[PDB]
Amino acid sequence: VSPKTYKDADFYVAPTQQDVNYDLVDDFGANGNDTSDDSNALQRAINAISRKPNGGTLLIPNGTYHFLGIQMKSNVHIRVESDVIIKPTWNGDGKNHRLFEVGVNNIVRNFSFQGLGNGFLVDFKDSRDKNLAVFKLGDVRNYKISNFTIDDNKTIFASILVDVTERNGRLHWSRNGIIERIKQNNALFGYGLIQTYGADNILFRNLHSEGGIALRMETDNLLMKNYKQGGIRNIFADNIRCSKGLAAVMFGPHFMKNGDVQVTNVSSVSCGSAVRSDSGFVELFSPTDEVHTRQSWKQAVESKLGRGCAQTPYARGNGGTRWAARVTQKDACLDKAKLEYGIEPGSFGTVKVFDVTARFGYNADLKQDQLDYFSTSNPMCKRVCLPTKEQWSKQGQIYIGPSLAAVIDTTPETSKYDYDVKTFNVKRINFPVNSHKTIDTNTESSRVCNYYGMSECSSSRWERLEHHHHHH
Ligand SMILES: [Ca+2]
Ligand code: NI
Questions:
Q1: N or C of the chain: less Cβ packing under 10 Å?
Q2: Which range marks the domain in which residue 134 is found?
Q3: CA atoms of 173 and 233, how far apart (whole Å)
Q4: For residue 86, how far is its CA from the centre of ligand 1 (angstroms)?
């Protein structure tokens, strides 16, 4: 079997007309030389540009800029010179920030943002703000974002949120685009370069995440739960790479029913696996006017579903009055929950991954529920470490240690909502004897690691100091 082919114009069509072309410093008064905020300048430039029926280009010239919460607009095409450094402007209000928002609070049509030459840098290393994404996308169509390195500091926040937004009683999200030639350094395990929530006809290409997951197809979030709208469809990716992370490519549908995805050329070095699949699952949320306790919400649920059909309900945020519970993964329970609440576990349609190469290493991101898969090849749990509380205060959520497999697949969960990640020409390099090529639901495991008394990771290892950057 052969992969499906395509051309860049299938996703993104560049402008044929242009009314204006400006320079961020010369025309708008950005200062590339001090540490002042350049947000106003950038936005004034963007605004002036979208004013014109055919828009135009704005050049961001060499220098160091500070931007935050900028609002993109239709028919603006930003070009960024290769010695630019972009930094998040400081904001101490403790909320979730992004450098750039595309179709989040408006509607955006023909838009691009491109590094020239060898690419530029977004730098988070000196930021005091932990809550940062580079781009958040909503209602945007026909776009290209392209060319740069993100120097992260394990912030909370996939860097690029291919996300939904809410306008006039429905959800909206991005249709045709390309996101390509981006490297991320020093990402947090539970995050990475791309996270997708709602997406039609998007090409993801030449993307690399150091840590976490490069292409996270984990389709979750409030608005989609509530509106029963969103998810991803007809996604193409090529050249997805992981280093010192969980996975290059990950499928995790949650509650959303997703479309088709095709991936070619997946590589990883020193990651959990090159490809990862999770089963879908259902959470039932208690009503927002009823006052509930954990035990009362479990009871409402076991009442309609059965003894044993609810998992341990957790708290909705702070408050303590609103509750959510996972339906147990048993066809029976899942069946009644379908009949009774009209909702089921999520899945993906046709999924094909071509050319997967996983190179063994010693510094993968590892989840605690994966450690027992070392039983066959690493029966003394060598080279696995626990991060200190200063490094990560919820000890046991993340470990650093040897690669486990080419492909991890937890999808066999359930009967009716199972989905099929087809993989082709899968290779491993330098895995030890008795190790796993695929890990699934049936794979034999057995505790060999000290979960909470094993030795702790050096600062050097946690902070990836051995990696001297050369994007310079
Ligand atoms: Ca400045
Ligand atoms: Ni760097």
A1: N
A2: 7-464
A3: 11
A4: 10
